[PDB]
Amino acid sequence: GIGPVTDLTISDGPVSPDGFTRQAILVNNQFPSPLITGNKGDRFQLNVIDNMNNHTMLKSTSIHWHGFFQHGTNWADGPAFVNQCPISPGHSFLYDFQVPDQAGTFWYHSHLSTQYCDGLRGPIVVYDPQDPHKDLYDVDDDSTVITLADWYHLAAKVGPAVPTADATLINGLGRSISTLNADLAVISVTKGKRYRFRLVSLSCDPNHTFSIDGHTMTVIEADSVNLKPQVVDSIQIFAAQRYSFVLNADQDIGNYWIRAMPNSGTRNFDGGVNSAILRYDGADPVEPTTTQTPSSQPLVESALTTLEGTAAPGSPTAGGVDLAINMAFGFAGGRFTINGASFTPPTVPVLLQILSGAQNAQDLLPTGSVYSLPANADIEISLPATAAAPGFPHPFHLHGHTFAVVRSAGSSTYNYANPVYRDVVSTGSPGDNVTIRFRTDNPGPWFLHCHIDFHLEAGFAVVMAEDIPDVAAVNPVPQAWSDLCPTYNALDPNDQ
Numbered sequence: 001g002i003g004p005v006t007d008l009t010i011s012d013g014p015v016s017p018d019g020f021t022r023q024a025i026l027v028n029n030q031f032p033s034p035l036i037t038g039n040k041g042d043r044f045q046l047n048v049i050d051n052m053n054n055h056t057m058l059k060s061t062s063i064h065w066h067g068f069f070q071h072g073t074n075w076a077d078g079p080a081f082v083n084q085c086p087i088s089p090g091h092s093f094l095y096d097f098q099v100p101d102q103a104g105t106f107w108y109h110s111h112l113s114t115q116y117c118d119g120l121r122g123p124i125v126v127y128d129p130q131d132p133h134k135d136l137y138d139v140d141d142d143s144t145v146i147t148l149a150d151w152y153h154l155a156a157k158v159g160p161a162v163p164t165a166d167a168t169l170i171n172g173l174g175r176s177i178s179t180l181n182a183d184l185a186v187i188s189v190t191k192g193k194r195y196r197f198r199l200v201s202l203s204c205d206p207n208h209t210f211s212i213d214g215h216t217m218t219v220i221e222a223d224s225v226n227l228k229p230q231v232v233d234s235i236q237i238f239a240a241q242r243y244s245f246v247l248n249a250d251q252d253i254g255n256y257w258i259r260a261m262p263n264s265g266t267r268n269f270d271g272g273v274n275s276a277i278l279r280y281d282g283a284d285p286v287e288p289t290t291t292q293t294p295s296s297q298p299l300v301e302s303a304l305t306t307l308e309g310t311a312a313p314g315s316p317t318a319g320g321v322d323l324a325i326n327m328a329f330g331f332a333g334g335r336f337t338i339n340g341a342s343f344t345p346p347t348v349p350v351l352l353q354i355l356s357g358a359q360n361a362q363d364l365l366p367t368g369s370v371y372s373l374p375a376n377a378d379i380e381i382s383l384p385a386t387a388a389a390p391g392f393p394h395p396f397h398l399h400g401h402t403f404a405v406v407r408s409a410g411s412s413t414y415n416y417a418n419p420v421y422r423d424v425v426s427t428g429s430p431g432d433n434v435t436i437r438f439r440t441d442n443p444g445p446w447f448l449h450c451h452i453d454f455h456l457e458a459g460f461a462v463v464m465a466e467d468i469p470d471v472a473a474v475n476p477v478p479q480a481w482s483d484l485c486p487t488y489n490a491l492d493p494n495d496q
């Protein structure tokens, strides 16, 4: 794909991924946003050029490179009012970082308000030249990235505060109930070959239960973390998660429905909604007529494990860490709260507050939403599900880190010995107590938030201000970053 060194010019333009025309955000004149690729170890220099003129979809922008640790480049992480002020329309801003020791499937998306819902979001693959799973597949390239996305006929700031999707897009295409003739995505395979498919959820809200008629899927990666291979016949993937799965194109040459059932909006497949086409070379260019069978080996997160079976940080019992934090979810005044506070973006980005002299979490805004974390410590965070935070299951995402999911949704057990590690986790449903652990090896302020973008917008976030005293020294910032806030703050309000 493009990158690791590339311009990304952001503009507004008409699109019709489901047959319906609407204005959306393009990236290098493309919708959906294009795939960016590099290799493990690469330096990425992604020059984001903000050419948008549409105020309703936000003329300013900021982009987060989801899944990348950004060690020593916290200023490049993307979240507006946490790690930067937005880039202003008519300006450009260079994200320049490296990706030491990561490889897998990632994505990028606007991290200003609900802007990515308007279409600034695309996949990223960082290949590993020594990928330990290479021996399982023959093909892994542009054409094996499979994105899922929600799509709305009304823009993020035009529809309901928490909208319902008119379509599910698979690789940027799909049908709405009003567009049953729209083009479907087609994914081609050749009989006898093995494919590393990289399934990326670009969704702003719904999760999708993904399956392919007549085929199983061997999962080998979760959110950029190599797993032990696990055969499954369906994958519930939440907003912002990734999986690689190997598909062996070992069935009869034909067309087979690829299905992505969301948890809200239209949940059926009538007339080819929520669907795409797996077409073996030599198949007729027509719609599949395959029928779905019940999933009998769904992916189960607590059954996943890392390739090395790496233990969770800290000691194998509850609270065996340096610092344990429970995040009690709630809702009040139409905003989400975590431990009683709703995140509201501060005028001065949290990172800039720290570089300006804020010496502890008590000094940081917004008050009540910022947690201090000590350096080089084992952290445990528990995220108990509650109906008091409406719109569960909420997929929580921690910036700056991968974490061990010691307890998954739908499971009553704790696993300190060999739990899956990942960066987005469903916190599930009342009764669940999803719990995660990570080591504070990455000084900086890092967002922790529900990745349903309408819920983030409603305050469902906190900031982990990790090792505040070393932030400035570990994250020296470039001049162009220092100029972001003065430029943005000089703007007319409707350009912000």
Ligand SMILES: *[C@@H]1O[C@H](CO)[C@@H](O[C@@H]2O[C@H](CO)[C@@H](O)[C@H](O)[C@H]2NC(C)=O)[C@H](O)[C@H]1NC(C)=O
Pocket (backbone or CB within 6 Å): 022, 023, 024, 054, 055, 056, 057, 153, 154, 155, 156, 158, 159
């Ligand atoms: C900027 O983007 C917005 C949102 O995409 C466009 O909003 C449309 O406005 C018309 C008229 O008010 C409505 O009938 C549409 O439903 C809106 N579209 C969507 C997708 O919400 C707006 O038109 C764009 N501005 C320009 C100049 O094109």
Ligand SMILES: *[C@@H]1O[C@H](CO)[C@@H](O[C@@H]2O[C@H](CO)[C@@H](O)[C@H](O)[C@H]2NC(C)=O)[C@H](O)[C@H]1NC(C)=O
Pocket (backbone or CB within 6 Å): 318, 319, 324, 325, 326, 382, 383, 384, 385, 432, 433
């Ligand atoms: C989810 O798990 C967390 C962490 O184990 C629980 O919070 C702990 O509960 C015990 C018993 O009340 C206290 O002694 C601890 O001090 C709490 N730990 C922390 C870090 O605050 C939490 O109660 C569980 N919540 C639900 C709803 O099941």
Ligand SMILES: [Cu+2]
Pocket (backbone or CB within 6 Å): 053, 055
């Ligand atoms: Cu204008």
Ligand SMILES: [Cu+2]
Pocket (backbone or CB within 6 Å): 064, 066, 109, 240, 397, 451
């Ligand atoms: Cu993200």
Ligand SMILES: [Cu+2]
Pocket (backbone or CB within 6 Å): 064, 065, 066, 067, 397, 398, 399, 400
């Ligand atoms: Cu992220």
Ligand SMILES: [Cu+2]
Pocket (backbone or CB within 6 Å): 071
């Ligand atoms: Cu370091």
Ligand SMILES: [Cu+2]
Pocket (backbone or CB within 6 Å): 090, 091, 092, 487
């Ligand atoms: Cu400028």
Ligand SMILES: [Cu+2]
Pocket (backbone or CB within 6 Å): 113, 114, 457
């Ligand atoms: Cu907002």
Ligand SMILES: [Cu+2]
Pocket (backbone or CB within 6 Å): 183
């Ligand atoms: Cu067509």
Ligand SMILES: [Cu+2]
Pocket (backbone or CB within 6 Å): 313, 314, 315, 377, 378
């Ligand atoms: Cu330890």
Ligand SMILES: [Cu+2]
Pocket (backbone or CB within 6 Å): 321, 322, 378
């Ligand atoms: Cu310790």
Ligand SMILES: [Cu+2]
Pocket (backbone or CB within 6 Å): 391, 392, 393, 394, 395, 450, 451, 452, 455, 456, 460
């Ligand atoms: Cu949520």
Ligand SMILES: [Cu+2]
Pocket (backbone or CB within 6 Å): 400, 401, 402, 438, 439, 440, 441, 442
């Ligand atoms: Cu880390």
Ligand SMILES: [Cu+2]
Pocket (backbone or CB within 6 Å): 439, 441
């Ligand atoms: Cu680490």
Ligand SMILES: [Cu+2]
Pocket (backbone or CB within 6 Å): 064, 079, 111, 397, 399, 447, 449
């Ligand atoms: Cu985020």
Ligand SMILES: [Cu+2]
Pocket (backbone or CB within 6 Å): 492, 494, 495
């Ligand atoms: Cu203006």
